[PDB]
Motif scaffolding. Structure first.
Motif, short mmCIF file in Angstrom:
data_model
loop_
_atom_site.label_atom_id
_atom_site.label_comp_id
_atom_site.label_asym_id
_atom_site.label_seq_id
_atom_site.Cartn_x
_atom_site.Cartn_y
_atom_site.Cartn_z
N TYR A 133 3.86 -54.24 6.47
CA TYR A 133 4.20 -55.31 7.41
C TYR A 133 5.22 -54.84 8.44
O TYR A 133 5.16 -55.26 9.61
CB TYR A 133 4.72 -56.53 6.65
N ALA A 134 6.15 -53.98 8.03
CA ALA A 134 7.13 -53.45 8.98
C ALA A 134 6.45 -52.64 10.08
O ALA A 134 6.81 -52.74 11.25
CB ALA A 134 8.17 -52.60 8.25
N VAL A 135 5.46 -51.82 9.70
CA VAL A 135 4.68 -51.10 10.70
C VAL A 135 3.83 -52.08 11.51
O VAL A 135 3.64 -51.90 12.72
CB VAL A 135 3.82 -50.02 10.02
N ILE A 136 3.33 -53.13 10.87
CA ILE A 136 2.45 -54.09 11.54
C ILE A 136 3.18 -54.78 12.68
O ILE A 136 2.65 -54.92 13.79
CB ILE A 136 1.92 -55.11 10.51
N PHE B 63 10.59 -51.39 18.39
CA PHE B 63 11.49 -50.24 18.46
C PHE B 63 11.08 -49.29 19.57
O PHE B 63 11.91 -48.80 20.34
CB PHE B 63 11.52 -49.53 17.10
N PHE B 64 9.78 -49.01 19.67
CA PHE B 64 9.25 -48.19 20.75
C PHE B 64 9.43 -48.84 22.11
O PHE B 64 9.39 -48.13 23.12
CB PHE B 64 7.77 -47.88 20.49
#
Length: 49
Positions: A38-41, A47-48
């Motif tokens: 979920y953090a990547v989702i 952040f990018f």
């Protein structure tokens, strides 16, 4: 019809019953947890940015 026919592929050859190959690679226990997924989702696009 030797089970296993090769030394390097003995892990996936039905280590519970009659010798065979599992019909798929995924379906068992995953390597990561839902949290990183979920953090990547969601957090990846911020952040990018």
């Amino acid at each position: 019809a030797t089970c296993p026919p090769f030394d390097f592929s003995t892990k996936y050859y039905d280590g519970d019953g009659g010798c065979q190959r599992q019909s798929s690679f995924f379906g068992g226990t995953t390597v990561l947890d839902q949290g990183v997924g979920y953090a990547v989702i969601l957090g990846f696009g911020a952040f990018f940015a």
